[PDB]
């Protein structure tokens, strides 16, 4: 690829990751307010955005790939958002048990 | 910008993000110990360090979006990582603190 | 440092971080179920995997700071990415387990 493609790739990822993040934070908000159904529904929607966001093999299939800060920003956003998706069950569960 | 420049900037982001990260973790320790006022105060402080680093990151990304080619730097990558993971922690820290509050 | 050595080290960090990550999430599942001894044991194991990958990262980063131009490595960025986010998970896991323990 060239930088533009890596960059546009970054943006599309930032796009999905940004949506998923919003729903996850909104889910936490819902769980905080006791609306657990909304939280679960918001989490599933976040899961959907993440599903579509989804290099190493490409780099290994030679070398290549141009450095793009936007592309790493997109990956980083996606990964930190997935980390949130991976622990949100517990945050919500702790809210339920607390209530 | 040359690699050295990105590297220096990377250190600057690490300085602010590391500081904010320490404050957020200290706020969790505070909340864990029942000092909710200290916890909230520390988050407000972390937020100020994050805003500084975040606006710089935003500026740098827009430079690339606008066409400028930014050189690769592991230090910059490290700064971005420190900042973004720290931002995530901040985005959810209210919930970890509230949870400690309800049980305490 | 060689480009080969960068990709290699990159993969090692991804492996260690991936290994630590799995244990941390398994640790969360254990705590949620009240298996605290198991949850704590997994976090200790995960911390040991993180330490090895983290010290590699510290050396790699110090090389750039000293003026060394590390070959551009996408594999290494991903190494850094997984490692740093897994460390964030470890910082958060402590509190999630403690909240579960108090709830227990």
UniProtKB/Swiss-Prot annotation, chain A:
Record text on cofactor binding: Binds 1 Mg(2+) ion per trimer.
Cofactor list: Mg(2+)
GO biological process per UniProt: phosphoenolpyruvate-dependent sugar phosphotransferase system
Taxonomic superkingdom: Bacteria
Residues where Mg(2+) binds: 76
Induction: By lactose. The operon consists of lacABCDFEGX. A second transcript of only lacF and lacE is also lactose-induced.
SUPFAM superfamilies given in the database record: Enzyme IIa from lactose specific PTS, IIa-lac (SSF46973)
GO molecular function: metal ion binding; transferase activity
GO CC annotations, alphabetized: cytoplasm
Description of how the protein assembles with itself and partners: Homotrimer.
Domain comment as written in the entry: The PTS EIIA type-3 domain is phosphorylated by phospho-HPr on a histidyl residue. Then, it transfers the phosphoryl group to the PTS EIIB type-3 domain.
Name of the protein in question: PTS system lactose-specific EIIA component
Organism: Lactococcus lactis subsp. lactis
Phylogenetic lineage: Bacteria, Bacillati, Bacillota, Bacilli, Lactobacillales
């Amino acid at each position: 690829m060239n930088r533009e493609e890596m960059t546009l790739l970054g943006f599309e990822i930032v796009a999905y990751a940004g949506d998923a993040r919003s729903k996850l934070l909104e889910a936490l908000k819902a769980a905080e307010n006791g609306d657990f159904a909304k939280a679960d529904s918001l989490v599933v929607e976040a899961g959907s955005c993440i599903a579509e966001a989804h290099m190493l093999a490409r780099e290994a299939s030679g070398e290549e790939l141009p450095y793009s800060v936007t592309m790493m920003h997109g990956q980083l956003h996606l990964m930190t958002t997935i980390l949130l998706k991976d622990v949100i069950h517990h945050l919500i569960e702790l809210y339920k048990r607390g209530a």
